[PDB]
Amino acid sequence: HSDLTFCEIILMEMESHDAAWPFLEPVNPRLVSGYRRIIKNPMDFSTMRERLLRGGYTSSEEFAADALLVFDNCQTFNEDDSEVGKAGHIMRRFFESRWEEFY
Ligand SMILES: NC1CCN(C(=O)c2ccc(=O)[nH]c2)CC1
């Protein structure tokens, strides 16, 4: 129970983060040229919210995997100095910090 409750705590805190804006909704490949081709497994906070709400995480590890996928995707598609990339670095470091401060 504590696994998914912390997952809920951190997910809520990421969803409400100032730097969360590139990750609140799935990237729309029709608006982002090359995204479909470059990013094999899209992931975003709302998709993680949907899976978490639907009970779809077996362990806290799977939730962390989806989160890390959000940020791996971000770093794969965006320059580190891009606005989305910079936000992704803030969000990634935030996630890793929060994750480690519990686990
Ligand atoms: N509604 C938001 C605004 C724009 N937005 C991006 O531009 C983006 C995010 C991640 C990425 O990898 N590439 C582009 C995220 C969705």
Q: Mind spelling out the 3-state secondary structure of the chain? A: CHHHHHHHHHHHHHHCCHHHCCCCCCCCCCCCCCHHHHCCCCCCHHHHHHHHHCCCCCCHHHHHHHHHHHHHHHHHHCCCCCHHHHHHHHHHHHHHHHHHCCC
Distance, CA 89 to ligand 1 centroid (Å)? 14
- Residue 43 CA from chain centroid, whole number: 6
What is the experimental resolution, given in Å to one decimal place?
A: 2.6
Query: Quick count: other Cβ atoms within 10 Å of Cβ 59?
Result: 11
Out of 25, 32, 79, give the residue to mutate to test ligand 1, the one with the largest number of ligand atoms within 8 Å of its CB.
Answer: 32
Method: X-ray
Distance, CA 27 to ligand 1 centroid (Å)? 5
Distance set, CA 86 to CA 9, 30, 61, 96 (Å): 23, 22, 25, 15
d(CA 89, CA 93): 6
d(CA 35, CA 101): 33
- Selection from 73, 43, 39, 57 nearest residue 2 by Cα: 57
Q: Which atom of ligand 1 is nearest to the CA of 26?
A: 16
Residue ranges of the domains in the chain? 1-101
Torsion of CA 38, 92, 78, 12, to 10 degrees: 80
d(CA 74, CA 102): 24
CATH 3.40.50.300 fits 1-101, yes or no: no
